[PDB]
Amino acid sequence: VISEKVRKALNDQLNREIYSSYLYLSMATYFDAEGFKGFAHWMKKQAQEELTHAMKFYEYIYERGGRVELEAIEKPPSNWNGIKDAFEAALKHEEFVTQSIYNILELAHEEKDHATVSFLKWFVDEQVEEEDQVREILDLLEK
Amino acid sequence: VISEKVRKALNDQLNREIYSSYLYLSMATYFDAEGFKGFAHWMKKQAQEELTHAMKFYEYIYERGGRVELEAIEKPPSNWNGIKDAFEAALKHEEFVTQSIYNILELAHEEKDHATVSFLKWFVDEQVEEEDQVREILDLLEK
Ligand SMILES: [Zn+2]
Ligand SMILES: [Zn+2]
Ligand SMILES: [Zn+2]
Ligand SMILES: [Zn+2]
C-alpha cells in the first residue's frame, strides 16, 4: 500500500499530465489558426498521449489502494511567436515534467516503495523519448 | 463564415464539453474509490465521449474560419451520496448542457446561420439519447 506522501505525489503528477494534455491541445489551437495542419496534428496526438499517461497514473493509484482527486486545470497560453517558439515551450515544459517525475522517484526510493520505483521507470524512459522528439524537430527547423 | 457572436457561443460550448468530460472522470474517481468498477467504467466511457464532442466543436470552428480558445477548467466535485446521487447530478448536468446547446440554436436561427443550425442537430439528438440513458439507469436502481 502506498504511503500518503507517495499517493499525493502521484496524484499531483496525474494532475500535471492532464495539464500537459491541455497545453498541447492549446498549441494545436494556435497551429490550426495559422493553417499549420501538420504541426497541429502532432500536438493533438501528443495531447492524446498525455491523457494515456494520466490514466496510467490513475489506475496505478487505485491498484495500490489510493484514490484520485482531480484539481482545477489552469488556463494554458494560446499564442506563441512562431513554430520554434511553441516547440521550445514544449521542450521547457517536458523538462519540468521530467524533474517532477524524478522527485517522485526519489521519494519512492526513500520510502523503499519498490513498486512505485518500478512503475515510474516506464515514464523516465518515455520522457527521454519525448524530449528527444521535440529536440529533433527543433533541429530540423533550425535557422 | 461564423459571426463573432456564434463563434464565441461555440467556443464556450467547447469549453463546457471539456468540463463535462472532467466531471464524468471525477465521478469515476468516486465510483472507483468505492469499488464500483462497472459504474466507474460507465463514467470513463462517457468522459471519453464528451471529449469527442469537444473535438467536433473544435473542428467545426476551424472549418467556419474561427479559432478555439481554451479556458481554465473548474475543479469538479469529487464526492456524492451514493450511486443514485451521482447519476442524478449527471442528469442535472446534462439538462444544463441541453439548455446551453438550445441557446446556440436560437442564436444561429437569429443570424440565419443554417450551417450552424445543421451542425447542432446531431448534438440535440445526442443529448436526448444521453438523458434517456441516465434516466434508464436511475429507474433501474429505483428504491
Ligand atoms: Zn506525460
Ligand atoms: Zn509529456
Ligand atoms: Zn457532450
Ligand atoms: Zn453529455
From TrEMBL, chains A, B:
Domain named Ferritin-like diiron: residues: 1-143
Positions bound to Fe(3+) 2: 17, 50, 53, 94, 130
Residues engaged in binding Mg(2+) 6: 114
Residues where Ca(2+) 3 binds: 49, 130, 133
Chain residues that bind Ca(2+) 6: 129
Binding locations of Zn(2+) 1: 17, 50
Amino acids binding Zn(2+) 3: 49, 126, 129-130
Residues given in the record as Fe(3+) 3 binding sites: 17, 50, 53, 130
Binding site for Mg(2+) 4: 49, 126, 129-130
Binding site for Mg(2+) 3: 49, 126
Pfam families linked to this entry: Ferritin
Family named by the database record: Belongs to the ferritin family. Prokaryotic subfamily.
Role of this protein: Iron-storage protein.
Name of the protein: Ferritin
